Amino acid sequence: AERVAAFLKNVWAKEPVLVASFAIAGLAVILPTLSPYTKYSLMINXXXXXXXXXXXXXXXXXXXXXXXXXXXXXXXXXXX
Amino acid sequence: XXXXXXXXXXXXXXXXXXXXXXXXXXGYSMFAVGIGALLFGYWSMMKWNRERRRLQIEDFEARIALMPL
């Protein structure tokens, strides 16, 4: 080792708070790209309606039913 | 007989000794509790946030269900 293990312990000796400022902030960029859970959070964010539902005129349409409990469009069922 | 001030030895009080000593935390042990509290912290917090989603959709559903409003 030349700078991986040799230079890392020098930061711990003088001004040790500098280690945490690079490590914690560094992991905050790497983790949201590789972990297989980040795509689930966007799904619920799009599913939650802020505005009222809009009614469209039906003339030969697939996956569209009444407001009553029936299999239509998609409807969120991701984890309970 | 003449009486004056008397000397006492016994233990001689024990002068100049370091009474300061490290206690409880050592170094590596406290970091295992520190990150351990963080790992327990985020995991328990996000479970309530997922439980909030059950309420979140259901609360906004009231506006969609009520159109005579």
Curated annotation (Swiss-Prot), chain A:
Spans traversing the lipid bilayer: 17-37
Residues modified to N-acetylalanine: 1
Subcellular location, record wording: Mitochondrion inner membrane
Entry keywords, A to Z: Acetylation, Electron transport, Membrane, Mitochondrion, Mitochondrion inner membrane, Respiratory chain, Transmembrane, Transmembrane helix, Transport
A GO CC term assigned to this protein in UniProt: mitochondrial inner membrane
Top-level taxon of origin: Eukaryota
Membrane topology type: Single-pass membrane protein
Annotated function: Accessory subunit of the mitochondrial membrane respiratory chain NADH dehydrogenase (Complex I), that is believed not to be involved in catalysis. Complex I functions in the transfer of electrons from NADH to the respiratory chain. The immediate electron acceptor for the enzyme is believed to be ubiquinone.
Family membership noted in the UniProt record: Belongs to the complex I NDUFA3 subunit family.
Subunit structure: Complex I is composed of 45 different subunits.
Protein's name in the database: NADH dehydrogenase [ubiquinone] 1 alpha subcomplex subunit 3
Swiss-Prot record, chain B:
Record localization: Mitochondrion inner membrane; Nucleus
Subunit structure, as described in the record: Complex I is composed of 45 different subunits. Interacts with CARD15, but not with CARD4. Interacts with STAT3, but not with STAT1, STAT2 and STAT5A. Interacts with OLFM4.
Protein's recorded name: NADH dehydrogenase [ubiquinone] 1 alpha subcomplex subunit 13
Family per similarity comment: Belongs to the complex I NDUFA13 subunit family.
Lineage: Eukaryota, Metazoa, Chordata, Craniata, Vertebrata
Function in brief: Accessory subunit of the mitochondrial membrane respiratory chain NADH dehydrogenase (Complex I), that is believed not to be involved in catalysis. Complex I functions in the transfer of electrons from NADH to the respiratory chain. The immediate electron acceptor for the enzyme is believed to be ubiquinone. Involved in the interferon/all-trans-retinoic acid (IFN/RA) induced cell death. This apoptotic activity is inhibited by interaction with viral IRF1. Prevents the transactivation of STAT3 target genes.
Range covered out of full length: 32 to 74 of 144
TM helices/strands, residue ranges: 27-46
Superkingdom, natural source: Eukaryota
Gene giving rise to this polypeptide: NDUFA13
Residues forming coiled coils: none
